[PDB]
Amino acid sequence: GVLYVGSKTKEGVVHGVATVAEKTKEQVTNVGGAVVTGVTAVAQKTVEGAGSIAAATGFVKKDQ
Amino acid sequence: GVLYVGSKTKEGVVHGVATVAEKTKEQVTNVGGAVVTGVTAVAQKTVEGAGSIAAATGFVKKDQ
Amino acid sequence: GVLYVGSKTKEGVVHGVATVAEKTKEQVTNVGGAVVTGVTAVAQKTVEGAGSIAAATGFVKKDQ
Amino acid sequence: GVLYVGSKTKEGVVHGVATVAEKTKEQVTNVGGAVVTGVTAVAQKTVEGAGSIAAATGFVKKDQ
Amino acid sequence: GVLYVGSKTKEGVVHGVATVAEKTKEQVTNVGGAVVTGVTAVAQKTVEGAGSIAAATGFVKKDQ
Amino acid sequence: GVLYVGSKTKEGVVHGVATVAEKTKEQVTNVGGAVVTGVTAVAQKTVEGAGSIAAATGFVKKDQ
C-alpha cells in the first residue's frame, strides 16, 4: 500500500547521461567471451526472481 | 505502507553522469572472459531474489 | 510504515559523476577473467536475497 | 516506522565525483583474475541477505 | 521508530570526491588475483546479513 | 526510538576526498594476491551480521 499526494517523485530513473567519446582506432577480438565498449543506461523499478540477472553490461555464464 | 504528502523524492536515481573519453588506440583481446570499457549507468528501485545479480558492469560465472 | 510531509529526499542516488579520461594507448588481453576500464554508476534503493550480488564493476566467480 | 516533516534528506547518496584521468599507455593482461581501472560510483539504500556482496569494484571468488 | 522535523540530514553519503590521476605508463599482469587502480565511491545506508561483504575495492576469496 | 528537531546531521559521511596523483610508471604483477592503487571512498550508515566485512580496500581470504 502506497499513497502520493501533491508530491513529485523519481523511482528507478536515469537522467542526463552526457558522453563524448573519441576513438581514432578501436580493435576488438572476442573468442567465446563478452566485450562491451559503448554507453549503457538501465532504469528499472523492480526486478524479481531467484538466480536472475537484472542489469548486465558485459556477460559470461558457463554454469556446470 | 508508505505515504508522501507535498514531498519531492528520488529513489534509485542516476542524475548528471557527464563524461569525456579520448582513446587514440584501444586494442582488446578476450578469450572466454569479460572486458568492459564504456559508460554504464544503472538505476534500480528494487532487485529481489536469492543468488541474483543486480548490476554487473563486467562478469564471469563458472559455477561447479 | 513510512510518512513524508513537505520533505525533499534522496534514497540511493548518484548525482554529478563528471569524468574526463585520456588514454592514448589502451591494450587489454583477457583470458577467463574480468577487466573493467570504463565508468560505472549504480543507484539502487533495495537489493534483497541471500547470496546475491548487488553491484559488480568487475567480477570472477568459480564456486565448487 | 519513519516520519519526515519539513526535512531535507540524503540516504545512500554519491554526489559530485569529479575525475580527470590521463594514461598515455595502459597495458592489461588478466588470466582468470579481476582487474578494474575505471571510475565506479555505487549508491545503495539497503542490501540484505546472508552471504551477499553489496558492492564489488574488482573481485575473484573460488569457494570450495 | 524515527521522526525528523525541520532537520537537514545525510545518512551514508559520499560528497565531492575530486581526483586528478596522471599515469604515463600502467602495466598490469594478473594471474588469478585482484587488481584495482581506479576511483571507487560507495555510499550505503544499510548492508545486512551474516557473512556478507558490504564494499570491496579489490578482493580474492578461496574459502575451503 | 529517534527524534531530530531543527538539527542539521551527518551519519556515515565522506566529504571532499580530493587527491591529485601523478605516477609516471606503474607495473603490477599479481599471482593470487590483491593489489589496490586507486582512490576509494566508502560511506556506510550500518553494516550488520556475524562474520561480515564492511569495507575492504585490498583483500585475500583463504579460510580453511
Swiss-Prot record, chains A, B, C, D, E, F:
This is Alpha-synuclein. It comes from Homo sapiens. Belongs to the synuclein family. It is linked to Genetic alterations of SNCA resulting in aberrant polymerization into fibrils, are associated with several neurodegenerative diseases (synucleinopathies). SNCA fibrillar aggregates represent the major non A-beta component of Alzheimer disease amyloid plaque, and a major component of Lewy body inclusions. They are also found within Lewy body (LB)-like intraneuronal inclusions, glial inclusions and axonal spheroids in neurodegeneration with brain iron accumulation type 1. Phosphorylated, predominantly on serine residues. Phosphorylation by CK1 appears to occur on residues distinct from the residue phosphorylated by other kinases. Hallmark lesions of neurodegenerative synucleinopathies contain alpha-synuclein that is modified by nitration of tyrosine residues and possibly by dityrosine cross-linking to generated stable oligomers. The modification Phosphoserine is found at residue 52. Cu cation binds at residue 15. Highly expressed in presynaptic terminals in the central nervous system. Expressed principally in brain. The lineage of its organism: Eukaryota, Metazoa, Chordata, Craniata, Vertebrata. The 'non A-beta component of Alzheimer disease amyloid plaque' domain (NAC domain) is involved in fibrils formation. The middle hydrophobic region forms the core of the filaments. The C-terminus may regulate aggregation and determine the diameter of the filaments.
